[PDB]
Protein backbone atom coordinates (compact mmCIF):
# COMPACT_ATOMS: atom_id res chain seq x y z
CA UNK A 1 0.00 0.00 0.00
CA UNK A 2 1.74 3.21 -1.45
CA UNK A 3 0.88 6.91 -1.74
CA UNK A 4 2.80 9.40 -4.20
CA UNK A 5 2.59 12.80 -3.46
CA UNK A 6 2.45 14.47 -6.93
CA UNK A 7 3.69 17.82 -5.04
CA UNK A 8 7.26 18.28 -3.93
CA UNK A 9 6.53 20.57 -1.96
CA UNK A 10 3.83 18.03 0.11
CA UNK A 11 6.65 15.49 0.59
CA UNK A 12 7.65 14.37 4.18
CA UNK A 13 11.38 14.93 4.21
CA UNK A 14 10.88 18.37 2.45
CA UNK A 15 12.77 20.24 4.99
CA UNK A 16 15.67 18.00 4.59
CA UNK A 17 15.88 18.28 1.41
CA UNK A 18 15.44 22.21 1.07
CA UNK A 19 18.15 22.65 3.41
CA UNK A 20 20.61 19.96 1.49
CA UNK A 21 23.35 22.12 -0.14
CA UNK A 22 22.85 23.36 -4.09
CA UNK A 23 25.96 20.65 -4.17
CA UNK A 24 24.14 17.63 -2.55
CA UNK A 25 20.42 18.93 -4.44
CA UNK A 26 22.29 18.58 -7.81
CA UNK A 27 23.22 14.71 -6.97
CA UNK A 28 19.37 14.05 -5.86
CA UNK A 29 18.15 15.47 -9.37
CA UNK A 30 21.16 12.69 -10.72
CA UNK A 31 19.14 9.98 -9.08
CA UNK A 32 15.47 10.96 -10.28
CA UNK A 33 17.30 11.27 -14.17
CA UNK A 34 18.12 7.72 -12.84
CA UNK A 35 14.79 6.67 -11.58
CA UNK A 36 13.37 6.99 -14.90
CA UNK A 37 15.19 4.77 -16.62
CA UNK A 38 14.86 2.23 -13.80
CA UNK A 39 10.70 2.80 -14.51
CA UNK A 40 11.14 2.90 -18.51
CA UNK A 41 12.95 -0.76 -17.89
CA UNK A 42 10.50 -2.19 -15.46
CA UNK A 43 7.68 -1.05 -18.36
CA UNK A 44 9.39 -3.57 -20.10
CA UNK A 45 9.93 -6.16 -17.66
CA UNK A 46 5.52 -5.86 -17.42
CA UNK A 47 4.82 -5.89 -21.00
CA UNK A 48 6.79 -9.12 -20.61
CA UNK A 49 4.82 -10.72 -17.81
CA UNK A 50 1.28 -9.39 -19.62
CA UNK A 51 2.78 -11.68 -22.75
CA UNK A 52 3.16 -14.23 -20.13
CA UNK A 53 0.19 -14.15 -18.79
CA UNK A 54 -0.85 -14.41 -22.02
CA UNK A 55 0.90 -17.48 -22.62
CA UNK A 56 -0.33 -19.46 -19.97
CA UNK A 57 -4.02 -18.52 -20.27
CA UNK A 58 -3.91 -21.19 -23.08
CA UNK A 59 -2.89 -23.23 -21.12
CA UNK A 60 -4.72 -22.70 -18.25
CA UNK A 61 -8.09 -23.04 -20.87
CA UNK A 62 -9.09 -26.86 -21.02
CA UNK A 63 -8.93 -27.22 -16.93
CA UNK A 64 -11.50 -24.12 -17.04
CA UNK A 65 -13.40 -25.61 -19.72
CA UNK A 66 -14.04 -29.45 -17.97
CA UNK A 67 -14.51 -27.52 -14.76
CA UNK A 68 -17.88 -25.57 -16.70
CA UNK A 69 -18.74 -28.86 -18.03
CA UNK A 70 -19.31 -30.11 -14.65
CA UNK A 71 -21.03 -27.37 -13.06
CA UNK A 72 -23.45 -27.17 -16.37
CA UNK A 73 -23.92 -31.05 -15.85
CA UNK A 74 -22.20 -31.97 -19.17
CA UNK A 75 -20.17 -34.29 -18.21
CA UNK A 76 -20.39 -36.66 -14.45
CA UNK A 77 -17.33 -37.44 -12.86
CA UNK A 78 -14.86 -40.04 -13.57
CA UNK A 79 -14.01 -42.38 -10.42
CA UNK A 80 -10.31 -40.64 -10.26
CA UNK A 81 -12.55 -37.37 -9.58
CA UNK A 82 -14.81 -39.07 -7.26
CA UNK A 83 -11.77 -40.03 -5.46
CA UNK A 84 -10.47 -36.40 -4.80
CA UNK A 85 -11.91 -34.99 -0.82
CA UNK A 86 -14.83 -33.13 -1.61
CA UNK A 87 -12.85 -30.39 1.55
CA UNK A 88 -9.38 -30.58 2.83
CA UNK A 89 -8.23 -31.38 6.70
CA UNK A 90 -10.62 -33.76 7.12
CA UNK A 91 -10.65 -37.43 8.41
CA UNK A 92 -11.36 -40.78 6.58
CA UNK A 93 -14.57 -41.11 9.39
CA UNK A 94 -14.88 -37.20 8.73
CA UNK A 95 -15.32 -37.65 4.75
CA UNK A 96 -17.16 -40.64 4.42
CA UNK A 97 -20.24 -39.44 7.03
CA UNK A 98 -19.87 -36.29 4.81
CA UNK A 99 -20.39 -38.46 2.21
CA UNK A 100 -23.71 -40.01 4.01
CA UNK A 101 -25.03 -36.98 4.92
CA UNK A 102 -27.43 -36.62 1.85
CA UNK A 103 -28.32 -38.96 -0.57
CA UNK A 104 -28.22 -38.37 -4.04
CA UNK A 105 -30.82 -36.20 -5.69
CA UNK A 106 -31.19 -37.74 -9.70
CA UNK A 107 -33.23 -34.38 -10.78
CA UNK A 108 -30.10 -32.39 -9.26
CA UNK A 109 -28.21 -31.72 -12.39
CA UNK A 110 -24.71 -29.75 -12.27
CA UNK A 111 -23.12 -27.62 -9.10
CA UNK A 112 -26.56 -25.17 -8.81
CA UNK A 113 -25.58 -21.49 -7.51
CA UNK A 114 -22.19 -22.25 -8.03
CA UNK A 115 -20.60 -18.88 -9.24
CA UNK A 116 -23.38 -17.00 -7.31
CA UNK A 117 -22.12 -18.36 -3.99
CA UNK A 118 -18.15 -18.28 -5.49
CA UNK A 119 -18.94 -14.85 -5.89
CA UNK A 120 -20.28 -14.16 -2.29
CA UNK A 121 -18.12 -15.61 -0.73
CA UNK A 122 -15.50 -13.10 -1.85
CA UNK A 123 -16.49 -10.11 1.06
CA UNK A 124 -15.26 -7.22 -2.02
CA UNK A 125 -17.98 -8.78 -4.47
CA UNK A 126 -20.21 -9.72 -2.06
CA UNK A 127 -21.22 -6.27 -1.11
CA UNK A 128 -21.75 -5.60 -4.82
CA UNK A 129 -24.31 -7.72 -4.61
CA UNK A 130 -27.89 -7.02 -3.93
CA UNK A 131 -30.84 -9.65 -3.40
CA UNK A 132 -32.41 -8.74 -6.56
CA UNK A 133 -29.01 -9.61 -8.55
CA UNK A 134 -29.09 -13.20 -6.52
CA UNK A 135 -31.80 -14.82 -8.47
CA UNK A 136 -30.21 -13.41 -11.89
CA UNK A 137 -26.37 -14.37 -10.70
CA UNK A 138 -27.83 -18.16 -10.38
CA UNK A 139 -28.09 -18.35 -14.12
CA UNK A 140 -24.16 -17.94 -14.30
CA UNK A 141 -22.62 -20.81 -16.32
CA UNK A 142 -19.23 -19.43 -16.47
CA UNK A 143 -16.84 -16.76 -15.83
CA UNK A 144 -13.72 -16.11 -17.61
CA UNK A 145 -10.76 -13.84 -18.36
CA UNK A 146 -8.34 -12.96 -21.02
CA UNK A 147 -5.46 -10.69 -21.39
CA UNK A 148 -5.14 -8.49 -24.97
CA UNK A 149 -2.09 -7.04 -26.26
CA UNK A 150 -3.35 -5.60 -29.25
CA UNK A 151 -5.42 -3.36 -27.35
CA UNK A 152 -3.70 -3.58 -24.21
CA UNK A 153 -5.91 -4.82 -20.95
CA UNK A 154 -7.73 -7.96 -19.94
CA UNK A 155 -11.89 -8.61 -20.25
CA UNK A 156 -14.00 -10.62 -17.96
CA UNK A 157 -16.83 -12.71 -19.67
CA UNK A 158 -19.99 -13.48 -17.36
CA UNK A 159 -21.26 -16.16 -19.43
CA UNK A 160 -25.65 -16.53 -18.60
CA UNK A 161 -28.17 -19.38 -19.57
CA UNK A 162 -30.79 -18.05 -21.00
CA UNK A 163 -33.36 -16.32 -18.57
CA UNK A 164 -35.43 -14.09 -17.96
CA UNK A 165 -33.72 -10.97 -16.86
CA UNK A 166 -31.91 -10.15 -19.97
CA UNK A 167 -31.27 -11.72 -23.61
CA UNK A 168 -27.44 -11.19 -23.13
CA UNK A 169 -25.42 -14.61 -23.43
CA UNK A 170 -22.41 -13.07 -22.09
CA UNK A 171 -21.69 -9.67 -20.32
CA UNK A 172 -18.24 -8.39 -21.15
CA UNK A 173 -16.07 -5.89 -19.22
CA UNK A 174 -13.07 -4.66 -20.39
CA UNK A 175 -10.14 -2.67 -18.89
CA UNK A 176 -7.31 -0.84 -21.19
CA UNK A 177 -4.26 -0.70 -19.62
CA UNK A 178 -1.24 1.18 -19.95
CA UNK A 179 2.01 -0.07 -20.02
CA UNK A 180 4.29 3.43 -20.91
CA UNK A 181 4.84 5.92 -17.95
CA UNK A 182 2.62 8.49 -18.47
CA UNK A 183 4.28 11.96 -19.08
CA UNK A 184 2.09 14.04 -16.93
CA UNK A 185 3.53 11.53 -13.71
CA UNK A 186 6.47 9.40 -14.99
CA UNK A 187 7.96 8.76 -12.08
CA UNK A 188 4.60 7.55 -10.52
CA UNK A 189 4.50 4.90 -12.45
CA UNK A 190 3.82 1.22 -10.62
CA UNK A 191 2.91 -0.51 -13.45
CA UNK A 192 0.31 -1.56 -15.70
CA UNK A 193 -2.54 1.38 -14.86
CA UNK A 194 -6.15 1.36 -15.92
CA UNK A 195 -7.19 4.09 -18.75
CA UNK A 196 -10.46 3.47 -19.20
CA UNK A 197 -12.96 0.32 -18.33
CA UNK A 198 -15.56 -0.28 -21.10
CA UNK A 199 -18.94 -2.27 -20.24
CA UNK A 200 -21.44 -3.68 -21.91
CA UNK A 201 -25.26 -3.24 -23.11
CA UNK A 202 -27.65 -5.48 -20.97
CA UNK A 203 -30.72 -5.69 -22.96
CA UNK A 204 -32.97 -6.11 -20.33
CA UNK A 205 -36.33 -7.62 -20.70
CA UNK A 206 -39.66 -5.69 -19.63
CA UNK A 207 -39.44 -4.73 -15.85
CA UNK A 208 -36.49 -6.68 -15.05
CA UNK A 209 -34.61 -4.14 -15.31
CA UNK A 210 -32.72 -4.62 -11.73
CA UNK A 211 -30.77 -1.02 -12.13
CA UNK A 212 -33.81 1.24 -12.23
CA UNK A 213 -36.32 1.86 -9.53
CA UNK A 214 -38.84 4.04 -8.31
CA UNK A 215 -36.75 6.19 -12.04
CA UNK A 216 -33.26 6.65 -10.33
CA UNK A 217 -30.31 4.51 -10.08
CA UNK A 218 -30.77 1.42 -8.31
CA UNK A 219 -27.83 -0.14 -6.21
CA UNK A 220 -27.20 -3.44 -8.03
CA UNK A 221 -23.81 -5.76 -9.41
CA UNK A 222 -25.03 -5.32 -12.70
CA UNK A 223 -24.26 -1.65 -12.70
CA UNK A 224 -20.46 -3.04 -12.83
CA UNK A 225 -21.43 -3.34 -16.84
CA UNK A 226 -21.80 0.56 -17.07
CA UNK A 227 -18.77 2.09 -15.78
CA UNK A 228 -18.62 6.11 -15.47
CA UNK A 229 -10.35 13.21 -8.21
CA UNK A 230 -13.61 11.37 -6.93
CA UNK A 231 -13.85 10.03 -10.96
CA UNK A 232 -10.50 8.90 -10.15
CA UNK A 233 -10.85 6.80 -7.23
CA UNK A 234 -14.38 5.45 -8.63
CA UNK A 235 -12.36 3.78 -11.25
CA UNK A 236 -9.82 2.60 -8.95
CA UNK A 237 -12.73 0.70 -7.10
CA UNK A 238 -14.38 -0.60 -10.40
CA UNK A 239 -11.18 -1.96 -11.31
CA UNK A 240 -9.90 -3.50 -7.67
CA UNK A 241 -13.57 -5.51 -8.26
CA UNK A 242 -12.40 -6.56 -11.94
CA UNK A 243 -9.02 -7.49 -10.74
CA UNK A 244 -10.17 -9.37 -7.33
CA UNK A 245 -12.88 -11.34 -9.94
CA UNK A 246 -9.80 -12.04 -12.56
CA UNK A 247 -7.04 -12.59 -10.39
CA UNK A 248 -8.71 -14.04 -7.46
CA UNK A 249 -12.03 -15.75 -8.02
CA UNK A 250 -12.07 -17.15 -11.56
CA UNK A 251 -8.45 -19.24 -10.96
CA UNK A 252 -9.58 -20.60 -7.47
CA UNK A 253 -13.80 -20.66 -7.79
CA UNK A 254 -14.01 -24.21 -6.07
CA UNK A 255 -12.40 -22.98 -2.96
CA UNK A 256 -14.98 -19.83 -2.78
CA UNK A 257 -17.57 -22.11 -3.66
CA UNK A 258 -16.89 -24.39 -0.28
CA UNK A 259 -15.69 -21.50 1.87
CA UNK A 260 -12.11 -23.47 2.25
CA UNK A 261 -11.02 -19.69 0.77
CA UNK A 262 -11.47 -16.48 1.78
CA UNK A 263 -10.95 -13.27 0.78
CA UNK B 1 -5.43 -10.50 1.39
CA UNK B 2 -6.77 -13.89 1.92
CA UNK B 3 -7.22 -16.91 4.18
CA UNK B 4 -7.41 -20.42 3.90
CA UNK B 5 -9.18 -23.18 6.42
CA UNK B 6 -7.01 -26.14 6.60
CA UNK B 7 -9.41 -27.75 7.85
CA UNK B 8 -12.87 -28.22 5.89
CA UNK B 9 -15.14 -28.93 8.59
CA UNK B 10 -14.64 -25.08 9.56
CA UNK B 11 -15.36 -23.86 6.25
CA UNK B 12 -17.46 -21.00 6.07
CA UNK B 13 -20.03 -22.71 3.76
CA UNK B 14 -20.27 -25.67 5.42
CA UNK B 15 -23.36 -26.39 5.97
CA UNK B 16 -24.19 -25.71 2.59
CA UNK B 17 -22.01 -28.83 1.05
CA UNK B 18 -22.69 -31.26 3.87
CA UNK B 19 -26.51 -30.84 2.69
CA UNK B 20 -25.61 -31.25 -0.92
CA UNK B 21 -26.76 -34.79 -2.59
CA UNK B 22 -23.82 -36.64 -3.15
CA UNK B 23 -24.30 -36.64 -6.48
CA UNK B 24 -23.33 -33.07 -6.67
CA UNK B 25 -21.15 -33.87 -4.14
CA UNK B 26 -19.10 -36.17 -6.70
CA UNK B 27 -19.04 -33.02 -8.84
CA UNK B 28 -17.83 -30.99 -6.44
CA UNK B 29 -14.95 -33.28 -5.68
CA UNK B 30 -13.86 -33.49 -9.81
CA UNK B 31 -13.61 -29.61 -9.04
CA UNK B 32 -11.50 -30.16 -6.46
CA UNK B 33 -9.48 -32.65 -8.55
CA UNK B 34 -9.69 -29.89 -11.26
CA UNK B 35 -8.44 -26.87 -8.54
CA UNK B 36 -5.00 -28.94 -8.52
CA UNK B 37 -4.20 -29.25 -12.20
CA UNK B 38 -5.40 -25.19 -12.68
CA UNK B 39 -2.81 -25.02 -9.39
CA UNK B 40 0.54 -26.78 -11.06
CA UNK B 41 0.26 -25.06 -14.28
CA UNK B 42 0.16 -21.63 -12.17
CA UNK B 43 3.15 -23.70 -10.92
CA UNK B 44 5.08 -23.31 -14.09
CA UNK B 45 4.05 -19.59 -14.64
CA UNK B 46 5.42 -18.29 -11.61
CA UNK B 47 8.74 -20.06 -12.36
CA UNK B 48 8.38 -18.05 -15.83
CA UNK B 49 8.00 -14.75 -13.87
CA UNK B 50 10.90 -15.54 -11.61
CA UNK B 51 13.05 -16.46 -14.47
CA UNK B 52 12.15 -13.04 -16.08
CA UNK B 53 13.38 -11.30 -12.85
CA UNK B 54 16.01 -12.62 -13.07
CA UNK B 55 16.39 -11.61 -16.84
CA UNK B 56 15.42 -8.09 -16.38
CA UNK B 57 17.70 -7.48 -12.80
CA UNK B 58 20.73 -7.84 -15.30
CA UNK B 59 19.02 -5.02 -17.27
CA UNK B 60 18.59 -3.16 -14.37
CA UNK B 61 21.85 -3.55 -12.58
CA UNK B 62 23.61 -0.77 -14.13
CA UNK B 63 21.00 2.11 -13.15
CA UNK B 64 21.07 0.78 -9.37
CA UNK B 65 25.22 0.89 -9.80
CA UNK B 66 25.29 4.38 -11.35
CA UNK B 67 22.90 5.64 -8.06
CA UNK B 68 25.63 4.03 -5.85
CA UNK B 69 28.20 5.59 -7.62
CA UNK B 70 26.31 8.97 -7.30
CA UNK B 71 25.42 8.11 -3.59
CA UNK B 72 29.05 7.65 -2.62
CA UNK B 73 30.03 11.04 -4.36
CA UNK B 74 32.30 8.90 -6.55
CA UNK B 75 30.68 10.45 -9.43
CA UNK B 76 29.73 13.98 -9.76
CA UNK B 77 26.36 15.20 -12.16
CA UNK B 78 25.95 15.78 -15.45
CA UNK B 79 23.96 18.71 -16.57
CA UNK B 80 21.07 16.61 -18.66
CA UNK B 81 21.24 14.93 -14.68
CA UNK B 82 21.31 18.27 -13.22
CA UNK B 83 18.68 19.72 -15.76
CA UNK B 84 15.84 16.92 -13.79
CA UNK B 85 13.85 18.78 -11.18
CA UNK B 86 14.48 17.46 -7.63
CA UNK B 87 11.06 17.26 -6.89
CA UNK B 88 7.93 16.53 -9.19
CA UNK B 89 4.55 18.91 -9.40
CA UNK B 90 6.63 21.93 -9.04
CA UNK B 91 7.23 25.63 -10.73
CA UNK B 92 9.79 27.05 -12.04
CA UNK B 93 9.79 29.82 -9.43
CA UNK B 94 9.32 26.99 -6.79
CA UNK B 95 12.10 24.84 -8.07
CA UNK B 96 13.83 28.05 -8.69
CA UNK B 97 13.78 29.53 -5.29
CA UNK B 98 14.52 25.47 -4.23
CA UNK B 99 17.98 25.53 -5.98
CA UNK B 100 18.93 28.83 -4.07
CA UNK B 101 17.35 27.93 -0.47
CA UNK B 102 21.10 26.57 0.45
CA UNK B 103 24.39 27.19 -1.54
CA UNK B 104 27.06 24.95 -2.10
CA UNK B 105 29.04 22.83 0.27
CA UNK B 106 32.31 21.69 -1.01
CA UNK B 107 32.82 19.52 1.92
CA UNK B 108 29.70 17.18 1.60
CA UNK B 109 30.54 14.32 -0.29
CA UNK B 110 28.05 12.40 -2.43
CA UNK B 111 24.36 12.03 -0.63
CA UNK B 112 24.47 11.43 3.21
CA UNK B 113 22.39 9.29 4.78
CA UNK B 114 20.01 8.49 1.71
CA UNK B 115 19.41 4.29 2.56
CA UNK B 116 19.01 5.67 6.02
CA UNK B 117 16.30 8.42 5.26
CA UNK B 118 15.48 5.79 2.46
CA UNK B 119 14.28 3.21 4.61
CA UNK B 120 13.04 4.93 7.45
CA UNK B 121 10.53 6.26 5.29
CA UNK B 122 8.90 3.40 4.20
CA UNK B 123 6.54 3.09 7.30
CA UNK B 124 7.50 -0.59 7.65
CA UNK B 125 11.12 -0.69 7.96
CA UNK B 126 11.08 2.56 10.03
CA UNK B 127 9.31 0.82 12.83
CA UNK B 128 12.32 -1.85 13.16
CA UNK B 129 14.86 0.78 13.18
CA UNK B 130 15.61 1.59 16.65
CA UNK B 131 17.64 5.00 17.57
CA UNK B 132 20.93 2.93 18.25
CA UNK B 133 20.55 1.42 14.76
CA UNK B 134 20.26 4.65 13.00
CA UNK B 135 24.25 5.71 13.44
CA UNK B 136 25.65 2.19 11.48
CA UNK B 137 23.02 2.78 8.97
CA UNK B 138 24.29 5.97 8.02
CA UNK B 139 27.57 3.92 6.78
CA UNK B 140 25.07 2.18 4.14
CA UNK B 141 26.61 2.40 0.87
CA UNK B 142 24.27 0.47 -1.07
CA UNK B 143 21.05 -2.30 -0.75
CA UNK B 144 21.01 -4.18 -3.93
CA UNK B 145 18.78 -7.17 -4.60
CA UNK B 146 19.02 -10.35 -6.52
CA UNK B 147 17.29 -13.62 -7.33
CA UNK B 148 18.32 -17.03 -7.63
CA UNK B 149 17.26 -20.02 -9.41
CA UNK B 150 19.58 -23.19 -8.42
CA UNK B 151 18.39 -22.02 -4.53
CA UNK B 152 14.89 -20.80 -5.54
CA UNK B 153 14.63 -17.30 -3.97
CA UNK B 154 16.60 -14.17 -3.64
CA UNK B 155 18.69 -12.28 -1.13
CA UNK B 156 19.25 -8.65 -0.19
CA UNK B 157 22.77 -7.26 0.36
CA UNK B 158 23.12 -4.33 2.56
CA UNK B 159 26.32 -2.74 1.69
CA UNK B 160 28.34 -0.82 4.23
CA UNK B 161 31.46 1.32 4.12
CA UNK B 162 34.42 0.89 6.49
CA UNK B 163 32.49 1.55 10.01
CA UNK B 164 33.38 1.12 14.05
CA UNK B 165 30.69 -1.42 15.01
CA UNK B 166 31.26 -4.37 12.82
CA UNK B 167 33.84 -5.47 10.46
CA UNK B 168 31.26 -6.81 7.70
CA UNK B 169 31.20 -4.84 4.12
CA UNK B 170 28.04 -6.32 2.91
CA UNK B 171 25.20 -8.09 4.86
CA UNK B 172 23.32 -10.57 3.42
CA UNK B 173 19.86 -12.10 3.87
CA UNK B 174 18.65 -14.79 2.32
CA UNK B 175 14.86 -16.50 1.70
CA UNK B 176 14.74 -19.58 0.08
CA UNK B 177 11.57 -20.06 -1.50
CA UNK B 178 9.30 -23.07 -3.25
CA UNK B 179 7.62 -23.10 -6.45
CA UNK B 180 5.85 -26.09 -6.15
CA UNK B 181 2.60 -26.76 -4.23
CA UNK B 182 3.23 -28.72 -1.06
CA UNK B 183 2.05 -32.24 -0.60
CA UNK B 184 0.59 -31.54 2.62
CA UNK B 185 -1.58 -28.29 1.57
CA UNK B 186 -1.36 -28.78 -2.66
CA UNK B 187 -5.00 -26.72 -3.15
CA UNK B 188 -3.18 -23.54 -0.92
CA UNK B 189 -0.82 -23.05 -3.23
CA UNK B 190 -0.88 -19.23 -3.98
CA UNK B 191 2.40 -18.65 -5.39
CA UNK B 192 6.04 -19.27 -4.66
CA UNK B 193 5.71 -19.85 -0.57
CA UNK B 194 8.90 -18.80 1.50
CA UNK B 195 10.62 -22.07 3.03
CA UNK B 196 13.17 -20.47 5.36
CA UNK B 197 15.17 -17.47 6.05
CA UNK B 198 18.54 -17.12 6.15
CA UNK B 199 20.76 -14.37 8.05
CA UNK B 200 24.31 -13.88 8.07
CA UNK B 201 27.04 -13.35 11.20
CA UNK B 202 27.74 -10.19 12.10
CA UNK B 203 31.38 -9.99 13.32
CA UNK B 204 30.43 -6.86 15.90
CA UNK B 205 33.35 -5.34 17.43
CA UNK B 206 33.70 -4.82 21.14
CA UNK B 207 31.21 -2.66 22.95
CA UNK B 208 29.19 -2.39 19.65
CA UNK B 209 26.51 -5.37 19.60
CA UNK B 210 23.00 -3.77 18.89
CA UNK B 211 21.33 -6.53 19.30
CA UNK B 212 21.86 -7.33 22.89
CA UNK B 213 21.74 -5.11 25.68
CA UNK B 214 22.39 -5.37 29.75
CA UNK B 215 22.70 -9.83 28.49
CA UNK B 216 19.20 -10.05 26.69
CA UNK B 217 17.67 -9.63 23.24
CA UNK B 218 17.71 -5.98 22.77
CA UNK B 219 15.44 -4.31 19.94
CA UNK B 220 17.42 -3.51 16.57
CA UNK B 221 17.23 -4.23 13.45
CA UNK B 222 19.99 -5.60 12.89
CA UNK B 223 17.99 -8.94 14.49
CA UNK B 224 16.80 -9.01 10.76
CA UNK B 225 20.27 -11.02 10.01
CA UNK B 226 19.36 -14.01 12.42
CA UNK B 227 16.04 -14.97 11.49
CA UNK B 228 14.46 -17.90 13.71
CA UNK B 229 1.72 -21.24 14.74
CA UNK B 230 3.48 -18.36 16.55
CA UNK B 231 6.86 -19.50 14.22
CA UNK B 232 4.70 -19.95 10.82
CA UNK B 233 3.79 -15.85 11.59
CA UNK B 234 7.20 -15.13 12.49
CA UNK B 235 8.63 -15.93 9.16
CA UNK B 236 5.67 -14.62 7.46
CA UNK B 237 6.74 -11.24 9.33
CA UNK B 238 10.20 -11.53 8.39
CA UNK B 239 9.42 -12.22 4.82
CA UNK B 240 7.28 -9.61 4.44
CA UNK B 241 9.65 -6.84 5.80
CA UNK B 242 12.28 -8.57 2.80
CA UNK B 243 10.03 -7.63 0.29
CA UNK B 244 9.20 -4.66 1.21
CA UNK B 245 12.79 -3.77 1.09
CA UNK B 246 13.36 -6.02 -2.38
CA UNK B 247 9.96 -5.04 -4.27
CA UNK B 248 9.73 -1.82 -3.00
CA UNK B 249 12.69 0.29 -1.69
CA UNK B 250 15.43 -0.86 -3.59
CA UNK B 251 14.14 -0.02 -7.09
CA UNK B 252 12.71 3.61 -6.23
CA UNK B 253 15.06 4.34 -3.48
CA UNK B 254 15.06 8.08 -4.28
CA UNK B 255 11.54 8.22 -4.05
CA UNK B 256 11.44 7.46 -0.53
CA UNK B 257 14.56 10.01 0.31
CA UNK B 258 12.43 12.62 -1.20
CA UNK B 259 9.50 11.53 0.79
CA UNK B 260 7.39 11.74 -2.38
CA UNK B 261 6.55 8.11 -2.33
CA UNK B 262 5.52 6.79 0.94
CA UNK B 263 4.46 2.91 1.39
ZN1 LIG C 1 -1.42 -8.44 -17.68
ZN1 LIG D 1 10.93 -14.38 -8.06
Same mark, same amino acid.
Given at each position: ?56 ? %? ?17 ? =? ?56 ? =? ?27 ? =? ?26 ? =? ?48 ? %? ?21
Amino acid at each position: NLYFQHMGLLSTNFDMIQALPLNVKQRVCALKNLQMKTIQIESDFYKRVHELEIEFE %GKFKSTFDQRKAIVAGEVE =PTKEQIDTPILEGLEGDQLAELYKAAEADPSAKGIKDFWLTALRTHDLVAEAIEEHDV =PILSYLTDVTTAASKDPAGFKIEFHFATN =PYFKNQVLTKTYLLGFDPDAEAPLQFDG =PHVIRAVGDTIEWEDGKNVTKKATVKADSFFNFFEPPEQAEEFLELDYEM %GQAIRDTIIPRAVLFYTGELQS
